[PDB]
Amino acid sequence: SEAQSRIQDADYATEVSNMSKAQIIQQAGNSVLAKANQVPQQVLSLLQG
Amino acid sequence: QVINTNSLSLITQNNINKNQSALSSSIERLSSGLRINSAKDDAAGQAIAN
Amino acid sequence: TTSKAESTSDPLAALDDAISQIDKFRSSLGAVQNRLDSAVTNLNNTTTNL
Amino acid sequence: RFTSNIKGLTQAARNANDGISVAQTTEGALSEINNNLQRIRELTVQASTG
Amino acid sequence: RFTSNIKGLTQAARNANDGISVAQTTEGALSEINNNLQRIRELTVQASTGTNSDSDLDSIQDEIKSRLDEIDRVSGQTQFNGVNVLAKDGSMKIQVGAN
Numbered sequence: 001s002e003a004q005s006r007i008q009d010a011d012y013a014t015e016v017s018n019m020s021k022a023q024i025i026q027q028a029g030n031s032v033l034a035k036a037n038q039v040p041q042q043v044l045s046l047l048q049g
Numbered sequence: 050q051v052i053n054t055n056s057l058s059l060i061t062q063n064n065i066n067k068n069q070s071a072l073s074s075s076i077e078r079l080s081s082g083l084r085i086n087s088a089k090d091d092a093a094g095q096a097i098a099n
Numbered sequence: 100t101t102s103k104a105e106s107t108s109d110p111l112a113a114l115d116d117a118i119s120q121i122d123k124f125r126s127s128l129g130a131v132q133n134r135l136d137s138a139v140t141n142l143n144n145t146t147t148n149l
Numbered sequence: 150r151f152t153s154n155i156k157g158l159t160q161a162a163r164n165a166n167d168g169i170s171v172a173q174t175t176e177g178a179l180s181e182i183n184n185n186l187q188r189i190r191e192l193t194v195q196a197s198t199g
Numbered sequence: 200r201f202t203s204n205i206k207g208l209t210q211a212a213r214n215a216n217d218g219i220s221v222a223q224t225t226e227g228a229l230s231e232i233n234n235n236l237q238r239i240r241e242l243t244v245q246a247s248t249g250t251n252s253d254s255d256l257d258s259i260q261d262e263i264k265s266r267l268d269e270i271d272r273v274s275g276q277t278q279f280n281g282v283n284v285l286a287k288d289g290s291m292k293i294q295v296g297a298n
Contacts, residue, residue, distance in 0.1 A: 007094050010084035019075035026072055029065040036058040043050060059147050066143060070136075087176050088129020089136070092262065093245070093255045095129075096122040099183065110197060114190045119254055121183050126258040128176045130265040135169045137269055141231050142162040145277065146155050148224040150280065 207297035218293040225284045228277040235266055235273075242266075 077086060085095045107113060246259045274285045282291075 004098055008083045008085065008098050010078055010082065012079070012082075015075050015078045019072065019079055022068060022072040022075050025068050026065065029061060029068060033058055033061040033065065036056070036061055037053075040053050040056070043052070063143055063147050067140070087132070087173070087180070088125045089132040090129070091245070092126040092129040093251070093258045095125065096254060096258060099118065099122060099187070110193045111190070114186065114193055117186055118183070118190070121179060121186065122254070123258065123261075125176065125179055125183070126261055128172055128179070130262040132169060132172045132176070133262070134265050134269045135165050135172065137231070137235060137266075138272075139162055139165045139169070141228070141273055141277075142158050142165065144227045144231065145224065146158040146162070148220070148227055149151055149155050149158070149279075 204297050211295050211297060214293055215295045218291075218295075221279050221284070221291075224277070224279050228273060228285065232270055232273055235270055239263060239266055 078084070085091060085098065088095055242259055242263055246256065251259075275283065277283065277285055
């Protein structure tokens with residue numbers, strides 16, 4: 001039983017940190033997506049319209 | 050200088066998509082408590098556990 | 100039309116073989132899943148670049 | 150030609166996603182069958198005793 | 200003469216940009232192939248251990264073969280405008296000048 005615990009039963013410390021990092025990177029990617037989408041209208045300003 | 054068809058926001062979307070799989074796997078692993086939930090992980094370890 | 104049935108000769112070994120077969124099928128499906136995931140990633144990168 | 154290529158590749162990506170879905174469904178069913186055979190093995194081990 | 204030169208230079212600039220693009224595509228394909236080979240190496244490092252039954256070796260070999268078949272499919276599959284970048288050991292020339 002102890003042996004089977006060594007293959008199953010993922011040690012929580014690794015994936016809690018992995019989840020925190022993944023969520024942080026996801027939020028960062030969302031922010032970068034919004035900010036990059038915020039760019040194009042520079043040409044609209046360039047048109048004087 | 051072009052309208053969003055050469056946009057690098059596509060690259061941002063791609064990176065978000067790659068991160069989404071890791072996020073989902075992390076949450077599912079956290080909920081289950083088992084390292085292997087299906088054979089998409091190490092199938093040999095799953096057979097050994099069985 | 101009817102034959103008297105006694106038992107299985109080796110009840111445990113046959114069940115172990117069935118477990119082995121089902122585990123091998125698990126492994127095949129898991130490999131297919133991982134390969135499909137890699138294909139999806141490839142296709143996303145290729146369509147972005149193109 | 151590039152537009153044709155990108156449209157086809159996107160649609161193929163969705164098709165691969167559907168393939169992953171069907172693989173997941175089959176694997177879940179097989180996992181449950183695995184549990185059922187495991188309990189059958191429990192019962193066999195108990196019943197082999199005299 | 201100057202008009203001819205500038206027109207040729209603009210065309211060469213677009214050609215060089217197209218070359219950069221095709222290089223990017225090939226690089227992405229190679230990156231993913233190398234990722235798959237990295238997974239192969241990890242699986243082999245696991246499989247070298249002697250604490251495994253032959254069923255474990257069979258499953259590991261099955262997944263290794265599947266992932267190698269993915270390598271082959273991606274290698275023969277990636278194309279850029281009717282040209283397979285990874286199918287031949289050839290050379291691809293880009294005109295970047297006016298002459």
